[PDB]
Amino acid sequence: YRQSSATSSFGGLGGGSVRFGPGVAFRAPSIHG
């Protein structure tokens, strides 16, 4: 599951995993797994 929240803060990356600042608001990982 690709993770995304901030815009134009990581550029165009194939993988969802992007660098995060002091505080990033993103969808928390699913309970599943």
Side-chain angles (χ1 to χ4, degrees):
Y1 189 104
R2 61 181 180 181
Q3 291 172 329
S4 180
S5 52
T7 58
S8 300
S9 297
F10 60 94
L13 295 169
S17 297
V18 296
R19 295 289 187 182
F20 305 109
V24 180
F26 63 92
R27 184 184 179 83
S30 176
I31 295 166
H32 321 141

